[PDB]
Amino acid sequence: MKYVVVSGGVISGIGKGVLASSTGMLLKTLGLKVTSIKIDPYMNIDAGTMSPLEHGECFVLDDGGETDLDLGNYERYLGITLSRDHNITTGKIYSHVISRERRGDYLGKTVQIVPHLTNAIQDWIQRVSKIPVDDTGLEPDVCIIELGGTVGDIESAPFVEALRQFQFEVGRENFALIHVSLVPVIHGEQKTKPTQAAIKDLRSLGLIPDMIACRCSEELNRSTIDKIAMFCHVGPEQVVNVHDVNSTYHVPLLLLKQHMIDYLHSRLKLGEVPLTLEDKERGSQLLTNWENMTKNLDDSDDVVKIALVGKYTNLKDSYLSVTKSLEHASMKCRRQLEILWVEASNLEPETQEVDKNKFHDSWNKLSSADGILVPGGFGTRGIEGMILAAKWARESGVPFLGVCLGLQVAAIEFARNVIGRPNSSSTEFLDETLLAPEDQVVITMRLGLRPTIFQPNSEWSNIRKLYGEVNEVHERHRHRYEINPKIVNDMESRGFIFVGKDETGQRCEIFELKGHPYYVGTQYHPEYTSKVLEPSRPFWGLVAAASGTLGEVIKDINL
Amino acid sequence: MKYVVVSGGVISGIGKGVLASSTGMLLKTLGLKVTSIKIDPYMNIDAGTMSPLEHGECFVLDDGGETDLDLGNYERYLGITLSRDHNITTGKIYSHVISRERRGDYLGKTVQIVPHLTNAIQDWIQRVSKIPVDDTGLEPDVCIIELGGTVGDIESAPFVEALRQFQFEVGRENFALIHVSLVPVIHGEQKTKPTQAAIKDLRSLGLIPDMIACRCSEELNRSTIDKIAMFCHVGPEQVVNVHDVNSTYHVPLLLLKQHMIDYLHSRLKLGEVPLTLEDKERGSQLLTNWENMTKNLDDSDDVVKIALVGKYTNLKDSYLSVTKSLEHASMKCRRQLEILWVEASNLEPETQEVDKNKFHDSWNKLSSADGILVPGGFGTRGIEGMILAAKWARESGVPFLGVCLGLQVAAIEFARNVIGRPNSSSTEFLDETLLAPEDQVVITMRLGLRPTIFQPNSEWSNIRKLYGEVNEVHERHRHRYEINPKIVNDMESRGFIFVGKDETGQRCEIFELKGHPYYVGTQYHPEYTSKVLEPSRPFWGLVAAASGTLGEVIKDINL
Amino acid sequence: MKYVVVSGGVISGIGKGVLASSTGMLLKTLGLKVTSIKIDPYMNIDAGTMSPLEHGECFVLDDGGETDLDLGNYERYLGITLSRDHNITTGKIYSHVISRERRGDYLGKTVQIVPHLTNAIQDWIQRVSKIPVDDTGLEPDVCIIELGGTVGDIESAPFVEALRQFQFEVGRENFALIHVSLVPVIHGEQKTKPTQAAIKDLRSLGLIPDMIACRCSEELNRSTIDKIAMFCHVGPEQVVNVHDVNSTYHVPLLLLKQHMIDYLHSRLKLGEVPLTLEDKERGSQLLTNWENMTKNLDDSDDVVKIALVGKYTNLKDSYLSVTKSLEHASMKCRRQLEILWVEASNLEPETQEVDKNKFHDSWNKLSSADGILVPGGFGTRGIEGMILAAKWARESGVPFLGVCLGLQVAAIEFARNVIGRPNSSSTEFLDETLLAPEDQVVITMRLGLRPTIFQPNSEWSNIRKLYGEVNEVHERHRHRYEINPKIVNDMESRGFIFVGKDETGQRCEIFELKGHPYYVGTQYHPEYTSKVLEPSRPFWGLVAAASGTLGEVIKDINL
Ligand SMILES: Nc1ncnc2c1ncn2[C@@H]1O[C@H](COP(=O)(O)OP(=O)(O)OP(=O)(O)O)[C@@H](O)[C@H]1O
Ligand SMILES: Nc1ncnc2c1ncn2[C@@H]1O[C@H](COP(=O)(O)OP(=O)(O)OP(=O)(O)O)[C@@H](O)[C@H]1O
Ligand SMILES: Nc1ncnc2c1ncn2[C@@H]1O[C@H](COP(=O)(O)OP(=O)(O)OP(=O)(O)O)[C@@H](O)[C@H]1O
Ligand SMILES: O=c1ccn([C@@H]2O[C@H](COP(=O)(O)OP(=O)(O)OP(=O)(O)O)[C@@H](O)[C@H]2O)c(=O)[nH]1
Ligand SMILES: O=c1ccn([C@@H]2O[C@H](COP(=O)(O)OP(=O)(O)OP(=O)(O)O)[C@@H](O)[C@H]2O)c(=O)[nH]1
Ligand SMILES: O=c1ccn([C@@H]2O[C@H](COP(=O)(O)OP(=O)(O)OP(=O)(O)O)[C@@H](O)[C@H]2O)c(=O)[nH]1
Ligand SMILES: [Mg+2]
Ligand SMILES: [Mg+2]
Ligand SMILES: [Mg+2]
Ligand SMILES: [Mg+2]
Ligand SMILES: [Mg+2]
Ligand SMILES: [Mg+2]
């Protein structure tokens, strides 16, 4: 096993997840199998309790693991599948040793943070980095560790001490450290003393970095590079200039231009890992596919506008996987994506009493949209706004996708406005009020990867067509409610066909409305299964419907 | 004596000299006598050997001290005069103890950095902070110490250790520390971990800050202030938000808006220093004069353009005192200054063979200029370009000031083009070549404050008029050459009158050319004597000549 | 050049000079030429101003360099001669860069502690480690650097930073670091946390140690060694157990038993330095001579007692070279030395009025003595006591040596008691009092190595015989006075022959008194020229006179 640790810096939120993902993608272009571990110094066992207002969206795994947003970045860049064990947290590792003590597995010794907890960390990283993450049952060749937080924080102290020991418990040339750092630019001068103080913290903590990755608002001056290469004991070829770029799909081709594969191949002896010529064709076949999609990103010009209708649309990280999944669809259509961020509460008429500026900008955006996404939000407070957005799309012929809550607000709209039961509602919003036309009912989270099976009278639908007309759809779930089965044949009598269901048939999972160009809803989250070179089919269908050429896309899918 | 230390930070060049000068100016608005000390952790005895390419211009004192650029900032903001002892350097203080050892004044003890060198530092700061710096023979009430470099550097280690001890060798409430710090803003988020790591270095080194001054590209968010006030054990009222502003004359009125006098008055018991009501009128009379010049900076609109003709005009700090002296003149004329920065070598015709873009932009600027300054540069390599700039101004009637080298290139121009000896030259450029018409000759630097006396037939001149027609001019010198006295009566026969001289008459120090609107030259540097509320008379005369209203200015000066 | 740095620790005065000297002596037993540098973080230019009450005796070099006591330890263990440049101090190196700045040799850059002062240190260590220190004009093969003070002190900061850089400016395998450390033993348990906190300071400062030398009141337990080898990343074979031993001549044979040559030979590639078989015989010929003198130290039993008569005899380090020179004489006679430490002031009768216990213990010791040394002290306050000790030895036939002041008090005794001028005196004690029989007169220190030449009528003397009857004696001087030449032929008429003089004959340097078994005085210090395997001839003559077998020693010297 080789290890690359991506670490620390002057600030949090600097770019370690981007460089970790680019490094893994780049190493994969030598044919190497790459895995990843996120370490988060936070104490939470997993992200499933904590709200999207900190660290962005909760990411959902095939396991049903509700995990760190960084694991989603590794899944999409590398083409890999991760377990809940691939996210280390302070909570998991302190919990592991405490549960092991009360059972007596330390045989009556005193259990100390060094060695015992720092040995639990190294036992975990070795257990987990050998887990299969590809379509093939090979153990990986490289693990990337993203060390969360900043080096020199109390919460990081056990993890840097475990990595200090891991650098020796595993051999040298099986371990490298990349340190990401900030170069401020002040009055036209690029300042080196923040990055120098960060190299002192690594030395203090007993680690040496093999690369410095410098994050800056400019290209680094070669005099600034020389200075960093004087204070840190590294050559000029070991400071990578990682400036601010408009697109993160370009960052792998920045580091390829900067010899970082060529360095790591000589620092980690990567040419001495056994690989076939088949593995070495697959590597450059991924590289040329990356150069293709990045060329097609730069010379594309024709725009498509998608309204994302939700709450808290100012924290754009609360929709990170949705956003990436709209981008992958856009890149496969070769049209420039603009997301129009629409707060659903501002669509409600009462906003015109509260602040007229917010009311009109929301409807200005929703009218401007070539397609609409209701993204699969959290907490029912915006539903009466999203019901307008679903009504607008159905009354007007505008392309629509409804994810999770986007099944539900669309079925609630269709019930109130096409069946004509005007109070019919989400039980999560009203519960004890006991209305008779319950659209949502509870059937205790239904979590992780499940099979969805198409109902037989459904090959007419665009959504079965986009999935290659394969009999089953396997996708990730994070829901507590269903559509009520008693209202299904009522809705189907009116053309709102539940095109796909759970194998038991009690649970409604995909619809398409008859006759509309594209009015699709999924109870799963199709975001989490999106890959950079293979967009998620419901999002590719929305961006194609919004662009025209939905038929030419369905034709290409059918080969 | 009270002490304010202004210190450290995440980066060098952060703003300590601006905040130190603003703090001293602000405290002076309570009637308090304020002094300053710069500590530079560099080893140089004084700046007189080191070139303007690092740390900007060398500043010249009345003593003839060639000192740090920061001492000039204190002189102009506070209205004070400083000795060469007011700049502490590592060289001076290590030299002081080494010279004292070889003489035996430690009486055969081992001389250690702690206590002995750190006691030399505290003996110096007490010796020097009692020196008179005003027009009155009172000892000061407050000393500002600017601690150069960054806290946590090896070169700073003896000075922070001396200040750690000085906080106790002098009482508490006679000492306060202001720490200047950087808040980066990255993806629209203001980052606190660089300022937290800087508070850990102060605690490690045994100092606590009383203010945090946060330097940022935005106003601080109140949540960012709350966070800094959680990690550092200080109230919200002790983080001052010192954002990037277009003008530094505004920075005192920022800190006045932020209660920093009101805090320091309760932290340093400044109301318990004895002062008269006369002292308390003088304080608010300076404050209202500052509010006047800053109001007159904001509502002024009509521009004046001055060409500054020199070398290395890309390092604008190489002309810092010249620049401030043009600004003070501009503020008293109530016209917005634009400095046009003109590289004199680019004015030479050979530049049109080398790069035509540089040739035309230089002459584009010099033609655009309402006035010209030849600023008093260093090293003769640009003189043939400045001779064109002096010719242009004389042939065309454009207002001119020549400082130091600007006497000399103008007299060299007047000799070559109006007397008609076409090879006549600066002996510093040609020496051993032994031409007969030597314009410069040597008469070993003539340094610091000297008297200049007006020749009798000179009250006609604008330059004697601008000086209030007072018989002597006292100004600062830093020159090795003179104009040749054998060429003086030749030049005076042609109207180039040497309006002022040294008391011996051998040495030529001020000219005015007959008939031209303003063609003045000084061998002294009038920059170093410029004050924010009283501009240097030769620069006020140039900016007035460039604006028109030179007569209305001379009238106001004559009262 | 190879470098070994001996460094730091938990406490000052731990044993670095003993381990540095043992390492150099041991490496010399491979035939390698070894040199040494002491770094002292004190500010003094040289030891010649500072009194023996701190850091022990001032050591005198052939240059006339008054230097650190540690340079004497290297001279005697290694068989080498050192210049005043071999002692680096903070004063010398800050003085060097400050003198170089005022002359302009930094060409107008800003001179910073890093790089410029830390480059002066590395330029010095390379300049000086190539200096010839043997009897042959070869440049050395190895330099030992003793880094004075403790690592993590402010005064050490520039020297550890220079050594951090020197580890890379010179290659790896040309540099090794030995760290000396304390293991306390508390309630029968050997404590490792002080040595762990010292390895953290080295990592913080960017150095890794190749050996840990652990100083302890016991042999280290192998569990304690294992623990130190867990926390520091080093094998068990790299912790050397350097326990408290009664004799320092044993410490080389401790480290030879502990494979420290065998480690350093593989860590520094010492087998790849070119050497002849002649060099490899000389190495083991020194080793077997060390095993001989250490065997002859352990199986010797018969005692000899020497009174050392001086001031401040409680600070035994104030006589370190005298003490070692009595030991080398004792080891060559094969008799166990006891120094009886006699305070000369306590010999004065007035002490019997002040404290009778001190009076009788002094005369109890002086009566017990088989020989007497007056050691060459400092400051005249004890002379009237030493005059009794010189009288006692002359009246009683007890063997005597008088060094520096020990010429002078003996001649003052002989004048007062055998010529019979009872007030005759040391001019340094009385000056302005102007007595006529001045024994001392001034002839401005007479410093360093000088030639002394024997007067012709002197081959009868034991002191000319002990020197091999060679015509000149070359020895080190540190005196300001002489014996008066006007009193010489008076003294010689009475049998007190001045057996040796300066080449000019004005200056009296060696005596022997006729008829007494051994009553010798030298104005030079014979201590500084003493070697472990070749004792200084005047001290070997005293210990032989005290033991009997002075004749058998003179016979062995005469071959
Ligand atoms: N080279 C880059 N150029 C521009 N933006 C970048 C670059 N690298 C990262 N970013 C952006 O910075 C933001 C945060 O980066 P990232 O998520 O990698 O942070 P982090 O330091 O790993 O920690 P956190 O998980 O707390 O955000 C994201 O919006 C990301 O797109
Ligand atoms: N509040 C501020 N807003 C905008 N510019 C500022 C502010 N404070 C300082 N500056 C500018 O920052 C630059 C450097 O500031 P300053 O000279 O005070 O730096 P310093 O940290 O004291 O050290 P140095 O002497 O090395 O420059 C100057 O151009 C100054 O005008
Ligand atoms: N292994 C040892 N066993 C016993 N005594 C020792 C040992 N090593 C050193 N010593 C004694 O310790 C004392 C101080 O040791 P040394 O002179 O080497 O100290 P240091 O740490 O180099 O610093 P300093 O020059 O300030 O004394 C001396 O008396 C010396 O003989
Ligand atoms: O105000 C100042 C700034 C600097 N200095 C002295 O000059 C040196 C200049 O160093 P700075 O700290 O100004 O910069 P740097 O070379 O470390 O690199 P950047 O932060 O710009 O990337 C400092 O280390 C200090 O010795 C002062 O004496 N005063
Ligand atoms: O990538 C990350 C970032 C952060 N964290 C965890 O969340 C915390 C968030 O802290 P950050 O370090 O992200 O910010 P902060 O609150 O210290 O303040 P600013 O720098 O933004 O001013 C960190 O201290 C760490 O515990 C991670 O686990 N991973
Ligand atoms: O009073 C105590 C002592 C120790 N301990 C806990 O037990 C551990 C025992 O560690 P100690 O600090 O007692 O010893 P050590 O193993 O570091 O080595 P020596 O200093 O003896 O050479 C400590 O690190 C701490 O975790 C306590 O909880 N309380
Ligand atoms: Mg935060
Ligand atoms: Mg991340
Ligand atoms: Mg710099
Ligand atoms: Mg400054
Ligand atoms: Mg020593
Ligand atoms: Mg223990």
Author numbering:
A (entry chain A), B (entry chain D), C (entry chain C): 1 to 443, 456 to 571
Question: What did the authors write?
Answer:
CTP synthase (CTPS) catalyzes the final, rate-limiting step of de novo CTP biosynthesis (Lieberman, 1956). Each CTPS monomer consists of a glutaminase domain and an amido-ligase domain connected by an alpha helical linker. Glutamine hydrolysis in the glutaminase domain produces ammonia which is transferred through a channel into the amido-ligase domain, where it is ligated to UTP to form CTP in an ATP-dependent process. Budding yeast have two CTPS isoforms, Ura7 and Ura8, which share 78 % identical residues.
To enable structure determination, we assembled filaments at pH 6.5, where single filaments predominate over larger bundles. We solved filament structures of both Ura7 and Ura8 in substrate- (ATP and UTP) and product- (CTP) bound states. Ura8 yielded the highest resolution structures, at 2.8 Å (substrates) and 3.8 Å (products). In the Ura8 structures, all ligands were clearly visible and bound as previously described for other CTPS homologs, including an imino-phosphate reaction intermediate recently observed in Drosophila CTPS, and the presence of two distinct CTP-binding sites per monomer recently reported in human and Drosophila CTPS. Helix 356–370 in the glutaminase domain mediates interactions between tetramers, so that each protomer is involved in assembly contacts. His360 interacts with D370 which would be stabilized by protonation of His360 at low pH, and likely explains the pH-sensitivity of the assembly interaction. We see density consistent with two rotamer positions of H360 that may reflect partial protonation of the sidechain at pH 6.5. One rotamer that likely reflects the protonated state interacts with D370, and the other rotamer that likely reflects an unprotonated state forms a hydrogen bond to a backbone carbonyl across the interface. The Ura8 product-bound filament is in the canonical inhibited conformation, but the substrate-bound structure is in a conformation intermediate between canonical active and inhibited states, in which the ammonia channel remains closed. This suggested to us that one function of yeast CTPS filaments is to constrain the enzyme in a low activity conformation.
